[PDB]
């Protein structure tokens, strides 16, 4: 049983890879660094139960994946943009950086999903879980471009799920914030930045960063299809910060 | 491990009991019919793994439950209002029916939660899952009173969770619609009422009623606390009808 | 033209009275202190163009108002709970206080509304504006009971509108926060509570309390019915605190 | 006093121009057809109070506008995509159409707003009103690409408002549906399609299309800043179809 995880080495990738693999999935992984055959050898060696794709184009990941199996049971569209770009203000930010925000967080996932419809349907169903952000639903002052791009994809989940659910393709969006991940809240920031500790104690009801195994637990639960009726919505993964 | 499920013979009750019980929990159940000793014995015989309470007051359920264990891991506040009162319109509806709508769907839950804080926190934490309704978030023309009351309890979850999450008491709200359940969408209805089939074919992307085992999956997932960071929010259980 | 403003001396009452009267309305006023004749007389003297009602029952205010006019063009359902009950927590709060929150903020406006349908319909329409609060939409940790109750009335507006709009009865909800008003954010608190001033600086984009005349204009705007298509929704009045 | 209205011959452009010029504004207009001198002249002659811009680039409209006045009081970023493109499905749509949907609906308005900040600020403030769509907040099965695009711009307003409001730059988003306009619900459509008549009967509480003057009403109201505390919110304009 195979799953596809994108941007495997960033954001929610590690948490996704680990959970699925522990659940018995063979995890086909995509990552920009995989354009380097050495990095693929490294990744698969350090990550038993995985296959590192060389494919870099969003519309071609599904076909590259299918070379390793009859069907794709689950896709985790693990889209991101590197810190500190997530905090790009409006004033002063280049047109090229704005275009890039939409390319990485909006267009890439649309092309990936568009390409995955025919195969996933022919297979009888699958689950497509988009990792977005709390801002794809609720606005933050320092995220004036990152929000709109993340928002575009949560809408994509909500609208497309209206037709794809009838084909057994279950779409979901997860909206993290205050999530211990290498991109936005690495362990070292928490360990070395009291300011982040004070913000969490102040704004996160749970009182702590969310763990990657919890992220993975949610990933695996949705991948199970056991609660199919919650299809088509955005799930806050923020420790009570949202709503 | 004990869980408490209220109005056990209605709404999400059967699904809740079956799943928790199936997952190893000893499920202490509440229900108005249990004031009768014979009904309590019959229920326990028909549902191995359960203890039926005689107690009927919302504020006394937690203490009655603790006579059966040291602590409560999960509470399913399965609140409902007998059909067809869910569809009571504003015009011509008596004051009494208006207050019963709030008593059964808003006041009762607050009174249960309220009485539950001290004991749950002293035990180190737990989950409290309110079974509400999709109208607790998105209005329906035929639910102008049933919505206001369901909306009150979803609000209760969102606010109370900002503070209780810190004591390890995790609050959630599940909002069903088109969920095969004895109170609002019994099997007899799906089997004999063309109209329901038409509505589902027209407005539920999933194209069918949600199954009890799917509501049981969701309840038991949340019960595990494996995905704690999604605490304090409302989950639609409508097969895509919502958002 | 005649308008009905409830709890005229509190919350958004003064804003509404001043603005509807500046607009030419003969504003019929309800208030708990009007059971006292001398208060009714001091209020009409201080507020020209106002008629003070002795009536205290939600279901009777409309017929009482009709004694001064052939029709009600606008109803401003200014519901509130006496300060500081708005901040009552979940734990340790008495059942009586919980009942009173729902009585003031949810039952009373429903009884009023219900009583207004037939006559506002026979008149061929009107506007009904419920002043609720930001927690009618988004949770605040310190409003776990006042929140749920406002959430009920906001849902009442959204549901009831689906049918009433057809009769020309246009419902709306305004949910203020940090709105300069005699009750929750009085000029007295702003001048003597540096913490409030700091919290507004930090959390409110407009950087200040909304003025009473700003409220009045939103209300005078809605009453004019010149933009009827925005019927049935909640309007945040927080200077950007929401969403 | 000047107002800038984009894509003035489409969507909400006509309503805006008529309303703002009637309200005393010199309305500077942008439109793809104004690349042609003849169209600008015919447009100027038939719309007293308007100035047609030859400028076609989003980030240059503000400077072009400023050749006609000292400041810009209001900007109406009326973005649209021609019908039937709004209805493009996810499957089979070209990458070019996908990209064009975002360019017209999200990237053009971002470039605009971005360019307006410095001057709008130095002038002490202004209002910026974005016409988006109901799918900017709620999904429709037939708008899986138009929706995302629109949602990014509602997200832009809500996030950007958090910082711009302090500068007196007030952002709003209006989301129509069932609004009589030349692009999505033209009068000839209404008069000639009994099917649209019946849907509206069925799904619009108000029972009819919103009128061009009601769009102008709302726009004129926002533009006066009389109710500045409602800044940074999305306003449904659907006759009650939403929420």
mmCIF file with all atom_site columns, C-alpha atoms in Angstrom, chain C residues 137 158 161-163 165-168 170 200-211 213-215 217-221 225-243, chain D residues 137 158 161-163 165-168 170 200-211 213-218 220-221 225-243:
data_model
loop_
_atom_site.group_PDB
_atom_site.id
_atom_site.type_symbol
_atom_site.label_atom_id
_atom_site.label_alt_id
_atom_site.label_comp_id
_atom_site.label_asym_id
_atom_site.label_entity_id
_atom_site.label_seq_id
_atom_site.pdbx_PDB_ins_code
_atom_site.Cartn_x
_atom_site.Cartn_y
_atom_site.Cartn_z
_atom_site.occupancy
_atom_site.B_iso_or_equiv
_atom_site.pdbx_formal_charge
_atom_site.auth_seq_id
_atom_site.auth_comp_id
_atom_site.auth_asym_id
_atom_site.auth_atom_id
_atom_site.pdbx_PDB_model_num
ATOM 1  C CA . UNK C 1 137 ? -18.873 34.449 16.315 1.00 0.00 ? 137 UNK C CA 1
ATOM 2  C CA . UNK C 1 158 ? -28.917 33.465 10.282 1.00 0.00 ? 158 UNK C CA 1
ATOM 3  C CA . UNK C 1 161 ? -33.539 35.160 7.898  1.00 0.00 ? 161 UNK C CA 1
ATOM 4  C CA . UNK C 1 162 ? -33.830 32.281 5.408  1.00 0.00 ? 162 UNK C CA 1
ATOM 5  C CA . UNK C 1 163 ? -37.614 32.539 5.657  1.00 0.00 ? 163 UNK C CA 1
ATOM 6  C CA . UNK C 1 165 ? -36.473 37.899 4.181  1.00 0.00 ? 165 UNK C CA 1
ATOM 7  C CA . UNK C 1 166 ? -39.207 36.718 1.820  1.00 0.00 ? 166 UNK C CA 1
ATOM 8  C CA . UNK C 1 167 ? -41.743 38.791 3.808  1.00 0.00 ? 167 UNK C CA 1
ATOM 9  C CA . UNK C 1 168 ? -39.433 41.783 3.668  1.00 0.00 ? 168 UNK C CA 1
ATOM 10 C CA . UNK C 1 170 ? -34.616 41.786 7.187  1.00 0.00 ? 170 UNK C CA 1
ATOM 11 C CA . UNK C 1 200 ? -6.503  48.143 22.540 1.00 0.00 ? 200 UNK C CA 1
ATOM 12 C CA . UNK C 1 201 ? -3.179  49.430 21.309 1.00 0.00 ? 201 UNK C CA 1
ATOM 13 C CA . UNK C 1 202 ? -1.824  45.908 20.921 1.00 0.00 ? 202 UNK C CA 1
ATOM 14 C CA . UNK C 1 203 ? -5.012  44.080 19.738 1.00 0.00 ? 203 UNK C CA 1
ATOM 15 C CA . UNK C 1 204 ? -7.261  46.460 17.843 1.00 0.00 ? 204 UNK C CA 1
ATOM 16 C CA . UNK C 1 205 ? -6.091  47.491 14.361 1.00 0.00 ? 205 UNK C CA 1
ATOM 17 C CA . UNK C 1 206 ? -8.059  50.772 14.270 1.00 0.00 ? 206 UNK C CA 1
ATOM 18 C CA . UNK C 1 207 ? -6.172  51.432 17.501 1.00 0.00 ? 207 UNK C CA 1
ATOM 19 C CA . UNK C 1 208 ? -9.102  52.860 19.458 1.00 0.00 ? 208 UNK C CA 1
ATOM 20 C CA . UNK C 1 209 ? -12.620 52.118 20.724 1.00 0.00 ? 209 UNK C CA 1
ATOM 21 C CA . UNK C 1 210 ? -15.387 52.363 18.103 1.00 0.00 ? 210 UNK C CA 1
ATOM 22 C CA . UNK C 1 211 ? -17.455 55.496 18.715 1.00 0.00 ? 211 UNK C CA 1
ATOM 23 C CA . UNK C 1 213 ? -21.856 57.546 16.272 1.00 0.00 ? 213 UNK C CA 1
ATOM 24 C CA . UNK C 1 214 ? -20.086 54.838 14.250 1.00 0.00 ? 214 UNK C CA 1
ATOM 25 C CA . UNK C 1 215 ? -22.511 52.289 15.720 1.00 0.00 ? 215 UNK C CA 1
ATOM 26 C CA . UNK C 1 217 ? -24.428 54.955 11.410 1.00 0.00 ? 217 UNK C CA 1
ATOM 27 C CA . UNK C 1 218 ? -24.205 51.205 10.848 1.00 0.00 ? 218 UNK C CA 1
ATOM 28 C CA . UNK C 1 219 ? -27.661 50.935 12.463 1.00 0.00 ? 219 UNK C CA 1
ATOM 29 C CA . UNK C 1 220 ? -29.138 53.896 10.503 1.00 0.00 ? 220 UNK C CA 1
ATOM 30 C CA . UNK C 1 221 ? -27.635 52.325 7.403  1.00 0.00 ? 221 UNK C CA 1
ATOM 31 C CA . UNK C 1 225 ? -32.834 48.973 3.770  1.00 0.00 ? 225 UNK C CA 1
ATOM 32 C CA . UNK C 1 226 ? -30.894 50.565 0.872  1.00 0.00 ? 226 UNK C CA 1
ATOM 33 C CA . UNK C 1 227 ? -28.566 47.473 0.809  1.00 0.00 ? 227 UNK C CA 1
ATOM 34 C CA . UNK C 1 228 ? -31.113 44.664 1.560  1.00 0.00 ? 228 UNK C CA 1
ATOM 35 C CA . UNK C 1 229 ? -28.990 41.944 -0.103 1.00 0.00 ? 229 UNK C CA 1
ATOM 36 C CA . UNK C 1 230 ? -26.608 41.836 2.925  1.00 0.00 ? 230 UNK C CA 1
ATOM 37 C CA . UNK C 1 231 ? -29.536 40.534 4.946  1.00 0.00 ? 231 UNK C CA 1
ATOM 38 C CA . UNK C 1 232 ? -29.066 37.578 7.395  1.00 0.00 ? 232 UNK C CA 1
ATOM 39 C CA . UNK C 1 233 ? -25.495 37.939 8.443  1.00 0.00 ? 233 UNK C CA 1
ATOM 40 C CA . UNK C 1 234 ? -23.267 38.949 11.327 1.00 0.00 ? 234 UNK C CA 1
ATOM 41 C CA . UNK C 1 235 ? -21.198 42.115 11.078 1.00 0.00 ? 235 UNK C CA 1
ATOM 42 C CA . UNK C 1 236 ? -18.133 42.338 13.325 1.00 0.00 ? 236 UNK C CA 1
ATOM 43 C CA . UNK C 1 237 ? -17.847 45.839 14.983 1.00 0.00 ? 237 UNK C CA 1
ATOM 44 C CA . UNK C 1 238 ? -14.382 45.536 16.500 1.00 0.00 ? 238 UNK C CA 1
ATOM 45 C CA . UNK C 1 239 ? -12.036 47.857 14.659 1.00 0.00 ? 239 UNK C CA 1
ATOM 46 C CA . UNK C 1 240 ? -10.414 44.833 12.968 1.00 0.00 ? 240 UNK C CA 1
ATOM 47 C CA . UNK C 1 241 ? -10.051 42.578 16.054 1.00 0.00 ? 241 UNK C CA 1
ATOM 48 C CA . UNK C 1 242 ? -12.119 40.000 14.094 1.00 0.00 ? 242 UNK C CA 1
ATOM 49 C CA . UNK C 1 243 ? -11.795 37.913 12.126 1.00 0.00 ? 243 UNK C CA 1
ATOM 50 C CA . UNK D 2 137 ? -15.919 32.375 1.899  1.00 0.00 ? 137 UNK D CA 1
ATOM 51 C CA . UNK D 2 158 ? -8.587  40.230 6.387  1.00 0.00 ? 158 UNK D CA 1
ATOM 52 C CA . UNK D 2 161 ? -6.391  45.115 7.536  1.00 0.00 ? 161 UNK D CA 1
ATOM 53 C CA . UNK D 2 162 ? -4.620  44.116 10.777 1.00 0.00 ? 162 UNK D CA 1
ATOM 54 C CA . UNK D 2 163 ? -1.803  46.526 9.970  1.00 0.00 ? 163 UNK D CA 1
ATOM 55 C CA . UNK D 2 165 ? -6.175  50.051 9.620  1.00 0.00 ? 165 UNK D CA 1
ATOM 56 C CA . UNK D 2 166 ? -3.802  51.786 12.004 1.00 0.00 ? 166 UNK D CA 1
ATOM 57 C CA . UNK D 2 167 ? -2.839  54.055 9.056  1.00 0.00 ? 167 UNK D CA 1
ATOM 58 C CA . UNK D 2 168 ? -6.479  54.897 8.455  1.00 0.00 ? 168 UNK D CA 1
ATOM 59 C CA . UNK D 2 170 ? -9.647  50.716 5.628  1.00 0.00 ? 170 UNK D CA 1
ATOM 60 C CA . UNK D 2 200 ? -33.464 32.253 -7.191 1.00 0.00 ? 200 UNK D CA 1
ATOM 61 C CA . UNK D 2 201 ? -36.962 31.431 -5.897 1.00 0.00 ? 201 UNK D CA 1
ATOM 62 C CA . UNK D 2 202 ? -35.529 28.279 -4.392 1.00 0.00 ? 202 UNK D CA 1
ATOM 63 C CA . UNK D 2 203 ? -32.218 29.502 -2.961 1.00 0.00 ? 203 UNK D CA 1
ATOM 64 C CA . UNK D 2 204 ? -32.398 33.216 -2.296 1.00 0.00 ? 204 UNK D CA 1
ATOM 65 C CA . UNK D 2 205 ? -34.399 34.175 0.814  1.00 0.00 ? 205 UNK D CA 1
ATOM 66 C CA . UNK D 2 206 ? -34.740 37.745 -0.534 1.00 0.00 ? 206 UNK D CA 1
ATOM 67 C CA . UNK D 2 207 ? -36.390 36.090 -3.602 1.00 0.00 ? 207 UNK D CA 1
ATOM 68 C CA . UNK D 2 208 ? -34.724 38.220 -6.243 1.00 0.00 ? 208 UNK D CA 1
ATOM 69 C CA . UNK D 2 209 ? -31.383 39.460 -7.607 1.00 0.00 ? 209 UNK D CA 1
ATOM 70 C CA . UNK D 2 210 ? -29.570 42.146 -5.584 1.00 0.00 ? 210 UNK D CA 1
ATOM 71 C CA . UNK D 2 211 ? -29.949 45.486 -7.435 1.00 0.00 ? 211 UNK D CA 1
ATOM 72 C CA . UNK D 2 213 ? -28.181 50.469 -6.626 1.00 0.00 ? 213 UNK D CA 1
ATOM 73 C CA . UNK D 2 214 ? -27.939 48.213 -3.489 1.00 0.00 ? 214 UNK D CA 1
ATOM 74 C CA . UNK D 2 215 ? -24.318 47.365 -4.434 1.00 0.00 ? 215 UNK D CA 1
ATOM 75 C CA . UNK D 2 216 ? -23.704 51.128 -4.834 1.00 0.00 ? 216 UNK D CA 1
ATOM 76 C CA . UNK D 2 217 ? -25.396 51.736 -1.458 1.00 0.00 ? 217 UNK D CA 1
ATOM 77 C CA . UNK D 2 218 ? -23.065 49.476 0.345  1.00 0.00 ? 218 UNK D CA 1
ATOM 78 C CA . UNK D 2 220 ? -21.020 54.453 -0.903 1.00 0.00 ? 220 UNK D CA 1
ATOM 79 C CA . UNK D 2 221 ? -21.556 53.603 2.786  1.00 0.00 ? 221 UNK D CA 1
ATOM 80 C CA . UNK D 2 225 ? -15.917 55.832 6.689  1.00 0.00 ? 225 UNK D CA 1
ATOM 81 C CA . UNK D 2 226 ? -18.908 56.609 8.901  1.00 0.00 ? 226 UNK D CA 1
ATOM 82 C CA . UNK D 2 227 ? -18.735 53.079 10.347 1.00 0.00 ? 227 UNK D CA 1
ATOM 83 C CA . UNK D 2 228 ? -14.942 52.572 10.386 1.00 0.00 ? 228 UNK D CA 1
ATOM 84 C CA . UNK D 2 229 ? -15.076 49.838 13.107 1.00 0.00 ? 229 UNK D CA 1
ATOM 85 C CA . UNK D 2 230 ? -16.419 47.250 10.609 1.00 0.00 ? 230 UNK D CA 1
ATOM 86 C CA . UNK D 2 231 ? -13.053 47.366 8.749  1.00 0.00 ? 231 UNK D CA 1
ATOM 87 C CA . UNK D 2 232 ? -11.285 44.171 7.562  1.00 0.00 ? 232 UNK D CA 1
ATOM 88 C CA . UNK D 2 233 ? -14.344 41.901 7.247  1.00 0.00 ? 233 UNK D CA 1
ATOM 89 C CA . UNK D 2 234 ? -16.030 40.108 4.312  1.00 0.00 ? 234 UNK D CA 1
ATOM 90 C CA . UNK D 2 235 ? -19.679 41.188 3.578  1.00 0.00 ? 235 UNK D CA 1
ATOM 91 C CA . UNK D 2 236 ? -21.885 38.609 1.903  1.00 0.00 ? 236 UNK D CA 1
ATOM 92 C CA . UNK D 2 237 ? -24.196 40.306 -0.717 1.00 0.00 ? 237 UNK D CA 1
ATOM 93 C CA . UNK D 2 238 ? -26.354 37.376 -1.659 1.00 0.00 ? 238 UNK D CA 1
ATOM 94 C CA . UNK D 2 239 ? -29.916 38.057 -0.663 1.00 0.00 ? 239 UNK D CA 1
ATOM 95 C CA . UNK D 2 240 ? -29.383 35.661 2.243  1.00 0.00 ? 240 UNK D CA 1
ATOM 96 C CA . UNK D 2 241 ? -28.029 32.747 0.316  1.00 0.00 ? 241 UNK D CA 1
ATOM 97 C CA . UNK D 2 242 ? -25.057 32.954 2.755  1.00 0.00 ? 242 UNK D CA 1
ATOM 98 C CA . UNK D 2 243 ? -24.314 32.061 5.435  1.00 0.00 ? 243 UNK D CA 1
#
